[PDB]
PDB file of all heavy atoms in Angstrom:
ATOM      1  N   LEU J 246     141.772 150.002  -2.350  1.00  0.00           N
ATOM      2  CA  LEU J 246     142.939 149.480  -3.141  1.00  0.00           C
ATOM      3  C   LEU J 246     142.800 149.555  -4.574  1.00  0.00           C
ATOM      4  O   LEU J 246     141.723 149.260  -5.148  1.00  0.00           O
ATOM      5  CB  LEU J 246     143.194 148.034  -2.693  1.00  0.00           C
ATOM      6  CG  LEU J 246     143.589 147.740  -1.307  1.00  0.00           C
ATOM      7  CD1 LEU J 246     143.424 146.310  -0.967  1.00  0.00           C
ATOM      8  CD2 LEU J 246     144.999 148.299  -0.965  1.00  0.00           C
ATOM      9  N   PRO J 247     143.930 149.887  -5.262  1.00  0.00           N
ATOM     10  CA  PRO J 247     143.822 149.715  -6.778  1.00  0.00           C
ATOM     11  C   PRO J 247     143.606 148.267  -6.996  1.00  0.00           C
ATOM     12  O   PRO J 247     144.215 147.432  -6.359  1.00  0.00           O
ATOM     13  CB  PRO J 247     145.355 150.117  -7.244  1.00  0.00           C
ATOM     14  CG  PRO J 247     145.880 150.876  -6.048  1.00  0.00           C
ATOM     15  CD  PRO J 247     145.182 150.401  -4.892  1.00  0.00           C
ATOM     16  N   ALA J 248     142.869 147.922  -7.932  1.00  0.00           N
ATOM     17  CA  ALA J 248     142.412 146.484  -8.259  1.00  0.00           C
ATOM     18  C   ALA J 248     143.513 145.730  -8.623  1.00  0.00           C
ATOM     19  O   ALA J 248     143.713 144.495  -8.286  1.00  0.00           O
ATOM     20  CB  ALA J 248     141.419 146.546  -9.410  1.00  0.00           C
ATOM     21  N   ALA J 249     144.594 146.278  -9.249  1.00  0.00           N
ATOM     22  CA  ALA J 249     145.766 145.542  -9.702  1.00  0.00           C
ATOM     23  C   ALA J 249     146.466 144.915  -8.443  1.00  0.00           C
ATOM     24  O   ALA J 249     147.265 143.997  -8.727  1.00  0.00           O
ATOM     25  CB  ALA J 249     146.726 146.334 -10.496  1.00  0.00           C
ATOM     26  N   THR J 250     146.333 145.462  -7.318  1.00  0.00           N
ATOM     27  CA  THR J 250     146.965 144.878  -6.071  1.00  0.00           C
ATOM     28  C   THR J 250     146.643 143.367  -5.991  1.00  0.00           C
ATOM     29  O   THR J 250     147.455 142.634  -5.421  1.00  0.00           O
ATOM     30  CB  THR J 250     146.415 145.707  -4.831  1.00  0.00           C
ATOM     31  OG1 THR J 250     146.604 147.112  -5.038  1.00  0.00           O
ATOM     32  CG2 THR J 250     147.164 145.164  -3.609  1.00  0.00           C
ATOM     33  N   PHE J 251     145.469 143.017  -6.457  1.00  0.00           N
ATOM     34  CA  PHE J 251     145.011 141.594  -6.196  1.00  0.00           C
ATOM     35  C   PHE J 251     145.735 140.607  -7.050  1.00  0.00           C
ATOM     36  O   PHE J 251     145.663 139.413  -6.736  1.00  0.00           O
ATOM     37  CB  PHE J 251     143.483 141.571  -6.349  1.00  0.00           C
ATOM     38  CG  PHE J 251     142.834 142.163  -5.082  1.00  0.00           C
ATOM     39  CD1 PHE J 251     142.610 143.497  -5.080  1.00  0.00           C
ATOM     40  CD2 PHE J 251     142.418 141.363  -4.119  1.00  0.00           C
ATOM     41  CE1 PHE J 251     142.069 144.082  -3.939  1.00  0.00           C
ATOM     42  CE2 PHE J 251     141.811 141.910  -2.967  1.00  0.00           C
ATOM     43  CZ  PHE J 251     141.632 143.266  -2.882  1.00  0.00           C
ATOM     44  N   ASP J 252     146.403 140.864  -8.073  1.00  0.00           N
ATOM     45  CA  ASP J 252     147.154 139.951  -8.878  1.00  0.00           C
ATOM     46  C   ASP J 252     148.715 140.248  -8.908  1.00  0.00           C
ATOM     47  O   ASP J 252     149.372 139.575  -9.716  1.00  0.00           O
ATOM     48  CB  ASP J 252     146.648 139.913 -10.310  1.00  0.00           C
ATOM     49  CG  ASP J 252     145.123 139.579 -10.264  1.00  0.00           C
ATOM     50  OD1 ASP J 252     144.774 138.491  -9.874  1.00  0.00           O
ATOM     51  OD2 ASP J 252     144.334 140.476 -10.704  1.00  0.00           O
ATOM     52  N   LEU J 253     149.202 140.997  -8.059  1.00  0.00           N
ATOM     53  CA  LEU J 253     150.607 141.190  -7.857  1.00  0.00           C
ATOM     54  C   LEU J 253     151.110 139.826  -7.399  1.00  0.00           C
ATOM     55  O   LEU J 253     150.562 139.259  -6.530  1.00  0.00           O
ATOM     56  CB  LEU J 253     150.931 142.306  -6.809  1.00  0.00           C
ATOM     57  CG  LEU J 253     150.562 143.675  -7.123  1.00  0.00           C
ATOM     58  CD1 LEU J 253     150.734 144.623  -6.029  1.00  0.00           C
ATOM     59  CD2 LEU J 253     151.263 144.230  -8.434  1.00  0.00           C
ATOM     60  N   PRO J 254     152.177 139.259  -8.064  1.00  0.00           N
ATOM     61  CA  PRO J 254     152.696 138.056  -7.684  1.00  0.00           C
ATOM     62  C   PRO J 254     153.478 138.095  -6.409  1.00  0.00           C
ATOM     63  O   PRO J 254     154.509 138.859  -6.497  1.00  0.00           O
ATOM     64  CB  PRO J 254     153.545 137.582  -8.965  1.00  0.00           C
ATOM     65  CG  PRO J 254     154.042 138.921  -9.473  1.00  0.00           C
ATOM     66  CD  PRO J 254     152.760 139.853  -9.362  1.00  0.00           C
ATOM     67  N   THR J 263     151.989 133.492  -4.597  1.00  0.00           N
ATOM     68  CA  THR J 263     150.536 133.585  -4.423  1.00  0.00           C
ATOM     69  C   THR J 263     150.051 135.014  -4.765  1.00  0.00           C
ATOM     70  O   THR J 263     150.868 135.800  -5.122  1.00  0.00           O
ATOM     71  CB  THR J 263     150.170 133.263  -2.886  1.00  0.00           C
ATOM     72  OG1 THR J 263     148.704 133.086  -2.834  1.00  0.00           O
ATOM     73  CG2 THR J 263     150.603 134.300  -1.898  1.00  0.00           C
ATOM     74  N   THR J 264     148.753 135.152  -4.667  1.00  0.00           N
ATOM     75  CA  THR J 264     148.172 136.440  -4.916  1.00  0.00           C
ATOM     76  C   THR J 264     147.061 136.705  -3.949  1.00  0.00           C
ATOM     77  O   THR J 264     146.443 135.840  -3.332  1.00  0.00           O
ATOM     78  CB  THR J 264     147.678 136.685  -6.321  1.00  0.00           C
ATOM     79  OG1 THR J 264     146.584 135.788  -6.519  1.00  0.00           O
ATOM     80  CG2 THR J 264     148.751 136.472  -7.307  1.00  0.00           C
ATOM     81  N   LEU J 265     146.628 138.029  -3.754  1.00  0.00           N
ATOM     82  CA  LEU J 265     145.446 138.289  -2.992  1.00  0.00           C
ATOM     83  C   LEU J 265     144.128 137.623  -3.485  1.00  0.00           C
ATOM     84  O   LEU J 265     143.315 137.112  -2.823  1.00  0.00           O
ATOM     85  CB  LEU J 265     145.181 139.711  -2.661  1.00  0.00           C
ATOM     86  CG  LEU J 265     146.448 140.388  -1.939  1.00  0.00           C
ATOM     87  CD1 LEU J 265     145.992 141.817  -1.748  1.00  0.00           C
ATOM     88  CD2 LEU J 265     146.952 139.587  -0.808  1.00  0.00           C
ATOM     89  N   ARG J 266     144.069 137.555  -4.860  1.00  0.00           N
ATOM     90  CA  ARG J 266     142.928 136.992  -5.505  1.00  0.00           C
ATOM     91  C   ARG J 266     142.699 135.515  -5.110  1.00  0.00           C
ATOM     92  O   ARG J 266     141.614 134.943  -5.050  1.00  0.00           O
ATOM     93  CB  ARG J 266     142.997 137.045  -7.064  1.00  0.00           C
ATOM     94  CG  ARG J 266     141.766 136.567  -7.877  1.00  0.00           C
ATOM     95  CD  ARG J 266     142.015 136.488  -9.284  1.00  0.00           C
ATOM     96  NE  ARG J 266     142.126 137.840  -9.785  1.00  0.00           N
ATOM     97  CZ  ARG J 266     141.190 138.643 -10.303  1.00  0.00           C
ATOM     98  NH1 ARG J 266     139.952 138.289 -10.305  1.00  0.00           N
ATOM     99  NH2 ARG J 266     141.589 139.852 -10.753  1.00  0.00           N
ATOM    100  N   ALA J 267     143.841 134.804  -4.912  1.00  0.00           N
ATOM    101  CA  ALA J 267     143.664 133.395  -4.368  1.00  0.00           C
ATOM    102  C   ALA J 267     142.903 133.273  -3.145  1.00  0.00           C
ATOM    103  O   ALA J 267     142.417 132.051  -2.807  1.00  0.00           O
ATOM    104  CB  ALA J 267     145.130 132.790  -4.193  1.00  0.00           C
ATOM    105  N   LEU J 273     140.349 137.841   4.896  1.00  0.00           N
ATOM    106  CA  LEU J 273     141.922 137.757   4.898  1.00  0.00           C
ATOM    107  C   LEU J 273     142.453 138.862   5.814  1.00  0.00           C
ATOM    108  O   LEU J 273     142.169 140.042   5.672  1.00  0.00           O
ATOM    109  CB  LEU J 273     142.363 137.967   3.499  1.00  0.00           C
ATOM    110  CG  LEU J 273     143.934 138.017   3.309  1.00  0.00           C
ATOM    111  CD1 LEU J 273     144.561 136.667   3.621  1.00  0.00           C
ATOM    112  CD2 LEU J 273     144.225 138.311   1.850  1.00  0.00           C
ATOM    113  N   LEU J 337     153.195 145.504  -3.082  1.00  0.00           N
ATOM    114  CA  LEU J 337     152.060 145.417  -2.193  1.00  0.00           C
ATOM    115  C   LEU J 337     152.097 146.420  -1.068  1.00  0.00           C
ATOM    116  O   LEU J 337     151.128 147.087  -0.735  1.00  0.00           O
ATOM    117  CB  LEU J 337     152.121 144.035  -1.664  1.00  0.00           C
ATOM    118  CG  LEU J 337     150.822 143.480  -0.830  1.00  0.00           C
ATOM    119  CD1 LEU J 337     149.690 143.485  -1.835  1.00  0.00           C
ATOM    120  CD2 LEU J 337     151.089 142.233  -0.167  1.00  0.00           C
ATOM    121  N   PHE J 341     149.355 149.502  -0.128  1.00  0.00           N
ATOM    122  CA  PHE J 341     148.805 149.727   1.191  1.00  0.00           C
ATOM    123  C   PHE J 341     149.339 150.957   1.950  1.00  0.00           C
ATOM    124  O   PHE J 341     148.920 151.230   3.064  1.00  0.00           O
ATOM    125  CB  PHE J 341     148.922 148.428   2.064  1.00  0.00           C
ATOM    126  CG  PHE J 341     147.903 147.345   1.808  1.00  0.00           C
ATOM    127  CD1 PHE J 341     148.170 146.505   0.752  1.00  0.00           C
ATOM    128  CD2 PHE J 341     146.723 147.207   2.421  1.00  0.00           C
ATOM    129  CE1 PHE J 341     147.364 145.438   0.456  1.00  0.00           C
ATOM    130  CE2 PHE J 341     145.791 146.289   2.084  1.00  0.00           C
ATOM    131  CZ  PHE J 341     146.139 145.351   1.069  1.00  0.00           C
ATOM    132  N   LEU J 364     140.453 142.201   5.225  1.00  0.00           N
ATOM    133  CA  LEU J 364     139.672 142.232   3.948  1.00  0.00           C
ATOM    134  C   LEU J 364     138.562 141.269   3.958  1.00  0.00           C
ATOM    135  O   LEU J 364     138.683 140.127   4.496  1.00  0.00           O
ATOM    136  CB  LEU J 364     140.698 141.888   2.790  1.00  0.00           C
ATOM    137  CG  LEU J 364     141.528 143.041   2.255  1.00  0.00           C
ATOM    138  CD1 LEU J 364     142.479 143.574   3.271  1.00  0.00           C
ATOM    139  CD2 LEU J 364     142.288 142.698   1.015  1.00  0.00           C
ATOM    140  N   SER J 365     137.516 141.724   3.418  1.00  0.00           N
ATOM    141  CA  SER J 365     136.312 140.876   3.310  1.00  0.00           C
ATOM    142  C   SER J 365     136.510 139.875   2.187  1.00  0.00           C
ATOM    143  O   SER J 365     137.474 139.880   1.496  1.00  0.00           O
ATOM    144  CB  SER J 365     135.150 141.792   2.911  1.00  0.00           C
ATOM    145  OG  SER J 365     135.171 142.192   1.562  1.00  0.00           O
ATOM    146  N   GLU J 367     135.135 139.559  -0.523  1.00  0.00           N
ATOM    147  CA  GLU J 367     135.153 140.249  -1.839  1.00  0.00           C
ATOM    148  C   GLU J 367     136.216 141.276  -1.991  1.00  0.00           C
ATOM    149  O   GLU J 367     136.277 141.997  -2.933  1.00  0.00           O
ATOM    150  CB  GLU J 367     133.834 140.792  -2.116  1.00  0.00           C
ATOM    151  CG  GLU J 367     132.693 139.922  -2.540  1.00  0.00           C
ATOM    152  CD  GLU J 367     131.895 139.227  -1.489  1.00  0.00           C
ATOM    153  OE1 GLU J 367     130.893 139.917  -1.100  1.00  0.00           O
ATOM    154  OE2 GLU J 367     132.221 138.144  -0.990  1.00  0.00           O
ATOM    155  N   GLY J 368     137.108 141.351  -1.035  1.00  0.00           N
ATOM    156  CA  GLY J 368     138.308 142.182  -1.172  1.00  0.00           C
ATOM    157  C   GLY J 368     138.136 143.634  -0.687  1.00  0.00           C
ATOM    158  O   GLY J 368     139.189 144.414  -0.830  1.00  0.00           O
ATOM    159  N   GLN J 369     137.134 143.964   0.111  1.00  0.00           N
ATOM    160  CA  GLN J 369     136.945 145.244   0.617  1.00  0.00           C
ATOM    161  C   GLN J 369     137.826 145.307   1.931  1.00  0.00           C
ATOM    162  O   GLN J 369     137.731 144.411   2.831  1.00  0.00           O
ATOM    163  CB  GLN J 369     135.438 145.588   0.965  1.00  0.00           C
ATOM    164  CG  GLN J 369     134.558 145.644  -0.265  1.00  0.00           C
ATOM    165  CD  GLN J 369     134.946 146.820  -1.160  1.00  0.00           C
ATOM    166  OE1 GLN J 369     134.653 147.935  -0.792  1.00  0.00           O
ATOM    167  NE2 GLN J 369     135.615 146.517  -2.212  1.00  0.00           N
ATOM    168  N   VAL J 370     138.533 146.441   2.175  1.00  0.00           N
ATOM    169  CA  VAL J 370     139.197 146.689   3.358  1.00  0.00           C
ATOM    170  C   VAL J 370     138.326 147.327   4.355  1.00  0.00           C
ATOM    171  O   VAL J 370     137.946 148.575   4.246  1.00  0.00           O
ATOM    172  CB  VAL J 370     140.459 147.608   3.072  1.00  0.00           C
ATOM    173  CG1 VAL J 370     141.209 147.814   4.401  1.00  0.00           C
ATOM    174  CG2 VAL J 370     141.363 147.078   1.960  1.00  0.00           C
TER     175      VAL J 370
END
Side-chain angles (χ1 to χ4, degrees):
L246 292 168
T250 308
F251 287 81
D252 301 297
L253 297 174
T263 192
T264 62
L265 307 184
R266 187 183 296 267
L273 182 64
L337 192 67
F341 283 83
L364 278 65
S365 75
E367 277 93 86
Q369 296 293 287
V370 185

